[PDB]
Design a protein around this ligand. Structure first.
Ligand code: NQK
Ligand code: NQK
Lengths: 123, 5, 123, 5
């Protein structure tokens, strides 16, 4: 019997990205070698199988710093973090391999799928 | 906006 | 130059509602007289002008319990909290006045607008 | 789903 506001989910995501920009209520730092990225644990868990596993673990849920595998590319992580908060993926010939490898590690299935398709089209 | 979902 | 995943924002919201259902990483209790509602501060701020003002205040941002005005109807609040996490508003003849009054207090402009329109259609 | 926004 409900009515639905079509734009509500995108409006919520836009506001969560505005909170991230202003560093409001961010509760974790993701460290990717020499780079640091502040974020909201809930958004990360909502977008990534890896973060869902980390922040549901009874010990790791309480950490304020998470260090990723040294093989992870910071630019690839940055592109994926932007996608989590905006639905837009900045996929380019020069970053697709790093984005795909990062999305595989983060367990972001739809991103991995589009990367595979864009690579297949070139070869 | 509002629609019937 | 980005590509966009159409369903991403709705998928994020669905996962945030699943976290709320399972009481995962909820960080505030909203008290509406005899009722309590657990939620995520970020989602509340993303949906309500009142919660945005509360959780950006340097003292109130740190409270784990927020008590609403005693005039606020718990069912109306519950319906609006469900709308925040799902984009679906359970508006009925028997609850529209309480939902509209609650949405005015919470500063949820689009909800107030649809309530006004449904009331105008009856009178 | 993916589209050009
Ligand atoms: C592999 N994989 C993926 O591509 N994405 C986008 C994923 C998101 C999650 N997150 C959740 C799954 C189920 N329930 C909840 Cl409550 C959450 C959350 N938050 C898990 C695995 C994911
Ligand atoms: C009156 N009103 C309304 O109808 N809704 C849905 C509102 C949401 C907010 N939240 C935000 C506004 C701006 N920037 C950020 Cl970062 C946020 C957030 N979070 C403020 C006022 C609102």
């Amino acid at each position: 019997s409900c009515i639905q506001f079509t734009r509500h989910a995108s409006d919520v995501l836009l506001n969560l990205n505005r909170l991230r920009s202003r560093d409001i209520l961010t509760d974790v730092v993701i460290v990717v070698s020499r780079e640091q990225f502040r974020a909201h644990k809930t958004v990360l868990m909502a977008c990534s199988g890896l973060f869902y596993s980390i922040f549901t673990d009874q010990l790791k849920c309480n950490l304020s710093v998470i260090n990723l595998d040294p093989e992870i590319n910071p630019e690839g992580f940055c592109i994926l973090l932007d996608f989590m908060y905006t639905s837009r993926l900045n996929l380019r010939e020069g970053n697709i391999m790093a984005v795909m490898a990062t999305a595989m590690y983060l367990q972001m299935e739809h991103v991995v799928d589009t990367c595979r398709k864009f690579i297949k089209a070139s070869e | 906006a509002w629609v019937i979902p």
